[PDB]
Ligand binder design. Structure first.
Ligand code: NAI
Ligand code: NAI
Ligand code: 3CR
Ligand code: 3CR
Ligand code: CA
Ligand code: CA
Lengths: 328, 328
């Protein structure tokens, strides 16, 4: 009895194999969608490993006859209808710890790139700009701002948010956060200021950074309405989920100068391109291809944890043996 | 009696005027060299304000008949033969406080850009790269590394170095420093590790960042010899002085992969260009046009301090009244 475990949206299973070699038949599908998956896998697969590049609706889930557990190789699971998955008897789990600090470090890099304009200054030199005089330095580096005394607003004070807050303090940022699902008192433990509404957050924050999961109640959390609530010349950073931001509203804000700059590692439609979308001709923009998470150590770590979860499921009882089940 | 005060390498004196209006005749020269300066200024100027774009040798200093004080609008004064200046009875002063944290923030941005590859990832998207799969993310973000447990080596633990150390700790960096002119015990106050030699520093450091002044004994401190002392795949960051690095040795190291990446805000010959010099075809390179210092608040601050120093000189006694004389 060697049940089938399938990596849906990937082609490499090397890291997972030594953890599943003796308890599972391991295959990959390199599929961007269900249509790309073989009937055999849909029919026989007892467990599934997936990243974020594929989405599983209830319809897509129904195509799995033997599937009993899904493990997201990552923390975000907005790409899975976990409630239905659970109704179908399919446990869904994630890997929340592997890339917390990598993601927090990327977030700070982006924040610092907006405040110090390092990436744009480098892009300009590549383009040929010559900066001889001090006058020119000020002109080309225009927009660069002193960080101390500035207020950083954190939306979602979880693992990454907390990691960001602690680093941000070391730069002299006054750190605020809005997280309506957290219990009373976390702000005291970490020496932070808390606000009760998103509007308060956006109103007092010079730089807004997103670190909340994408759920039923925060799609386009940043929109034409809430953008108007944001400070004039404010910064925006997103290393969480693209669906949190209406890129139409963000684009216009950037062109209008209502928002001085934005740094995005995630987008409404990924992969991102500078030639495709509302952000096409939008200025003062930094963008990275969902790589805030990445380091060799982290990638290996999350894949090893996911396989272990898969193994706990096959060898034990669902969902009692699971360490990171998000849909009990 | 309204003595002449001249801004040598600049054209704007607006910030200085309200501080000198009643005690000095203020003029500017917008000169990249002495040859560009009018005889009247060379003859009559009693005080001089200058940035870093002009250099004053003893020969250039001798062209000043009435000059009594020079104030560097900035901290670095390697562009002035201060010893000769003093022999000629000319006090030289600087402005060491204004852009400490700006410079430290830029330094961190660069360090984070090397470790997280944010600037290169953004450049790639601009170039058209499409990153659809996880495999592609790892490939394009290859070289991105986990920061915790890494060792940051600081050369020169002064104002900026200390500011960098404190921030760096917040990312999980193990921080070392080499500063042979500092007194016993500073390492204990700030919770840092100290080494006695440059070789030790370079040998234990995954990322090396420079924060020492340019003096008689550290030109090309980083050279073919000392580069060989650097760890394999090490990072290099420089926001201090260009003359500290032999760009020939750095280039070859980058091409050979002996150095994985370098981030430079200063250069042997400024202004810098990607089309001119040894770094011309050198890879894994980030470069900014000496803007680590810049913020509107800082620029105004240092100019106001410099004028005040000029005023202290005219209205008081040299060098007893001076706050920041570096060549007593
Ligand atoms: N770009 C990348 O490579 C990576 C992105 N991420 C993303 O970052 C996000 C945060 O990850 P973690 O901190 O590990 O998750 P977490 O579960 O530890 O933290 C989420 C926090 O956001 C809060 N939150 C949820 N909805 C909210 C709303 N509408 N307003 C305010 N706060 C809200 C929750 O109370 C929770 O404390 C995730 O959504 C994940 O998708 C995570 C890892 C890597
Ligand atoms: N790129 C920019 O916009 C800016 C650059 N800078 C540069 O950064 C450098 C540091 O500035 P601060 O920290 O304010 O100066 P500082 O005088 O406060 O610190 C200099 C430190 O370097 C140490 N040092 C000198 N020679 C050394 C050597 N051979 N090896 C090891 N350590 C050595 C000294 O002991 C001293 O502690 C300056 O040289 C300045 O030119 C400063 C401000 C802005
Ligand atoms: O966005 C996520 O859920 C991530 C990032 C990730 C993880 C694995 C592969 C790609 C991106 N969490 O780690
Ligand atoms: O390099 C320096 O000495 C600086 C940076 C600077 C200052 C004024 C104008 C340009 C650069 N110190 O602040
Ligand atoms: Ca502002
Ligand atoms: Ca290394």
């Amino acid at each position: 009895h060697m049940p089938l475990v399938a990596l849906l949206d990937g082609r490499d299973c090397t890291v997972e194999m030594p953890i599943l070699k003796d308890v599972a038949t391991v295959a990959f599908c390199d599929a961007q969608s269900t249509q790309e998956i073989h009937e055999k896998v849909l029919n026989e697969a007892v467990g599934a490993l997936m990243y974020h590049t594929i989405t599983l609706t209830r319809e897509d889930l129904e195509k799995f006859k033997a599937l009993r557990i899904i493990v997201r190789i990552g923390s975000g699971f907005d790409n899975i209808d976990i409630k239905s998955a659970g109704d179908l008897g399919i446990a869904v789990c994630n890997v929340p710890a592997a890339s917390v600090e990598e993601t927090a470090d990327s977030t700070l890099c982006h924040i610092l790139n907006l405040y110090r304009r390092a990436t744009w200054l480098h892009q300009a030199l590549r383009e040929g700009t010559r900066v001889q005089s001090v006058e020119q330095i000020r002109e080309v580096a225009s927009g660069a701002a002193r960080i101390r005394g500035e207020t950083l607003g954190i939306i979602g004070l979880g693992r990454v948010g907390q990691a960001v807050a602690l680093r941000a303090k070391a730069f002299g940022f006054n750190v605020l956060f809005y997280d309506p699902y957290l219990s009373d008192g976390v702000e005291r433990a970490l020496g932070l200021q808390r606000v009760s509404t998103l509007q308060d957050l956006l109103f007092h924050s010079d730089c807004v950074t997103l670190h909340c999961g994408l759920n039923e109640h925060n799609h386009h959390l940043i929109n034409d309405f809430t953008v108007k609530q944001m400070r004039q010349g404010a910064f925006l950073v997103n290393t969480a989920r693209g669906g949190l931001v209406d890129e139409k509203a963000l684009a216009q804000a950037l062109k209008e100068g209502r928002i001085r700059g934005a740094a995005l590692d995630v987008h409404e439609s990924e992969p991102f391109s500078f030639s495709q979308g509302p952000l096409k001709d939008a200025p003062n923009l930094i963008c990275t291809p969902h790589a805030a998470w990445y380091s060799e150590q982290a990638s290996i770590e999350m894949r090893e944890e996911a396989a272990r979860e898969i193994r706990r499921a096959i060898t034990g009882r669902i969902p009692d043996s699971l360490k990171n089940c998000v849909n009990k």
